[PDB]
């Protein structure tokens, strides 16, 4: 299937493409031709990946100099595996068409914990542990000692990789993570480091955001080599939250105590090093005078001189002083306090800690800790986190804020206070990506309206188009139910949350919808506490028992183990005729991680508009700062955060292969024009005024009829 696109001719593996695919390809080609960053939305969970990859490959063939390589990022490794599968299929199709191999390379990066071949680190699954063990095995000290070949466990894979892969790079091919593990085992090399080196000469590289956003690890692999590369973020509508998380650092009392203990161990190790080997490790002082990774981005990062901290004892005392200041500032009991610049000024005044020497604290920590030949960085990780916070605060506070919480939420009195350093704008941390890369395409599904995104992230978009899925059959028939059998408002307001009548309306709607809907249904609440209250009310009444009789019921919990077990049983229930009703939370990690396909989550129920609690002070900074700068109304941003989350958690049923399914929102709030307007275009256009505010019974009847229509073949 060769498509005569306006720009050029583009190959395509599958037989047919919908008109929305034509629109997507033409708009994407327009953006690439303009060579300017832009954002676009496409409904389908699958199909967008293949269309995007095919268009990018064709554009690379036409103008190889224009685009050096493609950097395609996905939320999670299980998801990016499907992307690499799609890319492998596309490459096989193109190779068959051409009749011969071409110099094209495509690979996926992942954590050493996810992929590795060392038996010692294999049993351990905790990421910091894998990082520390690998650092110990690959340490420059361990490398030098391996040169001596003394009796000590040395990781042969990295040494063999240094010997061979340095000389010879991999010719070409596509390697999934699992297949790359096998390749590393066969060749006695690192599946991780081999891909890391291939990044230098790779046409396509795929990895999650935390490999491309956080300055600590993103920069090293996203160096200026890709000066003009097509960087693409997929389903990255929750990009602001992750970009903020890449900067926010949380300091707790337990973490601070662990830091103090680690610092004591550091002092003891320094004394032992002084008595054992002093001159050779002191040469570090000379190289320092000449002049865990830094959190400072490219331009913000500075390397002039370490500062007043030039020796191990001096640096240790500096960390002692800063840790004492943080300890006392956290121990203070008072209302939540915000102080972005005042915190730095008060630190400098109270404990005599100048911001310039504080700036290089984390970098000097890395160097000095390397000198100590520590067993691993896992033990001292809390100290490195505190150092990253210490350097960040002295680095900048213009678009940041230090929040102190002597008392935690959900606890009238708790002896574990927490100090947050949550950011307020993601533009600060995502600026390097936009500036360095010629164009970035934020391709997303279920995207809340694009107009806000340029305001939140400071960039000038080239194209702003919303693509609506078009099929010969109406795959999706969304509806909103606001009126119950009692013709009573069913809004899940904070003041209306306690309403037993509203809870009863929700329970009856779920009962009837489970009675009619086929096997497999997922209901998303607004919070764990609200979900528990509704479940308890239904349990006190007889509605819950009737729901249990009609279909099996499963519930989500904060604990990941129970969540995984419940979802595993839910899948089997969906396969069998019992069916299942999975209650979950919109913010729950399960909602974002899981993907619902044919005969999975057939009818997506949304109980109440997803709104975060109006007491969490972090969101207060994040929101009022957005009001002050970029001029976004607080209510506007709050409703945007609700609609984007709802679209995220309700857009799964249309994953791909044209699998029918209905999305019912049991809240009259969605019927409001603002919510409908902010809803994604593809869902909204299907939505109509006739079914906008159906009663519970009317919604059930129309759902039954729509399921009848979708049951029959094409």
């Amino acid at each position: 299937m060769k498509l005569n696109v306006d720009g050029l001719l583009v190959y395509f593996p599958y037989d047919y493409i919908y008109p929305e695919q034509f629109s997507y390809m033409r708009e994407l080609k327009r953006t690439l031709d303009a060579k300017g960053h832009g954002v676009l939305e496409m409904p389908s969970g699958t199909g967008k990946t293949v269309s995007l990859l095919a268009l990018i490959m064709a554009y690379q063939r036409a103008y190889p100099l224009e685009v050096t390589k493609l950097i395609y990022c996905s939320r999670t490794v299980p998801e990016i595996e499907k992307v690499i599968e799609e890319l492998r299929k596309l490459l096989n199709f193109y190779e068959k068409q051409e009749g011969e191999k071409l110099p094209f390379l495509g690979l996926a990066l992942s954590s050493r914990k996810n992929l590795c071949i060392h038996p010692e680190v294999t049993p351990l699954r905790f990421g910091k542990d894998v990082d520390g063990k690998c650092h110990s095995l690959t340490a420059s000290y361990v490398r030098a000692q391996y040169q001596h070949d003394t009796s000590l466990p040395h990781c042969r894979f990295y040494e063999e990789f240094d010997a061979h892969g340095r000389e010879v790079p991999l010719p070409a091919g596509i390697y999934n993570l699992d297949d790359l593990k096998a390749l590393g085992r066969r060749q006695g090399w690192c599946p991780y480091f081999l891909a890391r080196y291939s990044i230098l000469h790779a046409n396509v590289v795929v990895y999650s955001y935390h490999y491309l956003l956080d300055p600590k690890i993103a920069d090293l692999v996203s160096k200026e080599l890709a000066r003009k590369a097509v960087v693409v973020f997929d389903e990255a509508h929750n990009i602001d939250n992750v970009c903020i998380d890449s900067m926010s650092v949380n300091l707790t009392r337990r973490t601070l105590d662990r830091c103090q203990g680690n610092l004591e161990t550091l002092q003891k190790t320094v004394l032992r090093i002084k008595e054992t080997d002093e001159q050779r490790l002191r040469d570090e002082y000379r190289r320092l005078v000449e002049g865990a990774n830094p959190v400072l981005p490219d331009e913000v990062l500075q390397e002039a001189v370490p500062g007043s901290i030039r020796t191990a004892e001096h640096f240790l005392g500096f960390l002692r002083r800063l840790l004492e200041y943080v300890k006392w500032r956290l121990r203070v009991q008072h209302v939540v306090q915000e102080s972005p610049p005042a915190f730095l000024s008060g630190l400098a005044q109270r404990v005599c800690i100048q911001r310039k020497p504080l700036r290089f604290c984390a970098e000097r920590l890395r160097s000095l800790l390397h000198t100590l030949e520590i067993t691993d960085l896992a033990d001292f990780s809390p100290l490195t986190l505190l150092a990253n916070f210490a350097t960040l605060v002295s680095t900048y506070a213009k678009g940041f804020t230090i929040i102190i919480e002597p008392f935690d939420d959900r606890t009238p009195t708790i002896a574990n206070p927490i100090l947050h350093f949550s950011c307020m704008d993601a533009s600060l941390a995502i600026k390097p990506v936009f500036e360095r890369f010629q164009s970035v395409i934020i391709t997303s599904g279920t995207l809340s309206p694009l107009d806000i995104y340029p305001k939140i992230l400071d960039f000038h978009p080239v194209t702003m188009a919303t693509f609506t899925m078009t099929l010969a059959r109406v795959c999706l028939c969304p509806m909103i139910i606001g009126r119950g059998n009692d013709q009573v408002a069913i809004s899940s307001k904070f003041e209306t949350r306690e309403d037993i009548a509203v809870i009863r309306n929700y329970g009856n709607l779920l009962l009837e919808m489970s009675a009619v809907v086929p096997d497999g249904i997922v209901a998303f609440f607004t919070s764990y506490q609200y979900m528990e209250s509704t479940v308890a009310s239904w349990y006190e009444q007889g509605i819950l028992e009737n729901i249990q009789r009609n279909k099996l019921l499963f519930i989500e919990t904060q604990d990941g183990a129970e969540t995984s077990v419940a979802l595993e049983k839910y899948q089997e229930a969906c396969e069998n005729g019992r069916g299942a009703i999975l209650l979950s939370v919109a913010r729950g990690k399960v909602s974002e991680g899981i993907d619902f396909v044919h005969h999975y989550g057939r009818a997506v129920i949304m109980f109440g508009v997803p709104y975060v609690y109006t007491q969490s002070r972090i969101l207060k900074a994040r929101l009022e700062y957005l009001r002050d700068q970029f001029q976004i109304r607080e209510n506007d941003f709050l409703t945007f955060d609700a609609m984007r989350h709802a679209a995220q958690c309700v857009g799964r049923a249309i994953r791909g292969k044209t699998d029918y399914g209905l999305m019912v929102f049991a809240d009259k709030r969605f019927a409001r024009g603002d919510k409908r307007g902010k809803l994604p275009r593809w869902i909204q256009e299907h939505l109509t005024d006739a079914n906008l505010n159906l009663t519970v019974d009317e919604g059930v009847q129309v759902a039954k009829y729509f399921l009848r229509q979708m049951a029959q073949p094409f």
Partner: protein
Amino acid sequence: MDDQGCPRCKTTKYRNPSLKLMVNVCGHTLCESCVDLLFVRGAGNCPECGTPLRKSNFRVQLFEDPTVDKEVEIRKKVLKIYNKREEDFPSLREYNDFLEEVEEIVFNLTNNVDLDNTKKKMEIYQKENKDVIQKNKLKLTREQEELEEALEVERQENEQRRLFIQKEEQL
């Protein structure tokens, strides 16, 4: 307040944390209920060490770590010296070399004998006070004044923003 207790009367440190450390030439975790016990007999003598004190050598401080207490007080005293701004020296190394010597002096004073430090500090007193020390006292006073002025300007702007949006709504 996290300290287990005074070397002698570790009681108050358990009942209430209101007591704050008292700095002395000895460098000690002294506590007010124990300061009264020192005043009653000796009147300015460390109980165990017996170090003489002119006038009780007592000043309030707030950190559970006695080493941090001594280090912070010594740094407070030292900052009065070597306060010249960085830009006064064009040499790249000299920017932080003198700070290295300053912190070395602080660590020296914390534990080792301070006689050499005092003699050196006399030498720096004579040579630098002639011109530079008083000049940088003036400049640091100017920057303290202007930082307090700038914070009051920030808070005037925030009060005006609050009250003007309130008057927008009511109008």
